Ligand binder design. Structure first.
Ligand SMILES: *[C@@H]1O[C@H](CO)[C@@H](O)[C@H](O)[C@H]1NC(C)=O
Ligand SMILES: *[C@@H]1O[C@H](CO)[C@@H](O)[C@H](O)[C@H]1NC(C)=O
Ligand SMILES: *[C@@H]1O[C@H](CO)[C@@H](O)[C@H](O)[C@H]1NC(C)=O
Lengths: 35, 49, 35
């Protein structure tokens, strides 16, 4: 319903926490199911 | 320009966002502007006539 | 570039909630990988 809008990506202040740790928890998941 | 031209250089602004900077000075946010922009215009067009 | 600033440790309000889950995840990592 809004006019004049444009498309753009938006960020969240949680990927400086989560996406610095979800890759770290996936790295721990690599060691979790290694044997 | 809005209100800036009385206090320095004239800064041009589009008029749909000037209402968004004037609802916000009342106490209701700018969320209630673009959602029903057409009926605000019809309430404004019929008022001056 | 500022006069008279003071060194201090500013806390993070989202830190200890996930930090309490860190050792809970490490408990699963210890419980699965080691045996
Ligand atoms: C600005 O106005 C012109 C004139 O009608 C129009 O063609 C153009 O689409 C408008 N700009 C936007 C972003 O809608
Ligand atoms: C934004 O993207 C969606 C789908 O990706 C598309 O349908 C829409 O037309 C796009 N809007 C603009 C203004 O580019
Ligand atoms: C704050 O810490 C830095 C680095 O640890 C140190 O160089 C500085 O002398 C400290 N004190 C200040 C800025 O008053």
């Amino acid at each position: 319903v809004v006019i004049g809008i444009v498309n753009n990506t938006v960020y969240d202040p949680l990927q400086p926490e989560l996406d610095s740790f979800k890759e770290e928890l996936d790295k721990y998941f690599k060691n979790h199911t290694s044997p | 320009s809005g209100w800036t031209f009385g206090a320095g250089p004239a800064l041009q602004i589009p008029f749909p966002m000037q209402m968004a900077y004037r609802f916000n000075g009342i106490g209701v946010t700018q969320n209630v502007l673009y959602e029903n922009q057409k009926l605000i215009a019809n309430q404004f067009n019929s008022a001056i006539g």
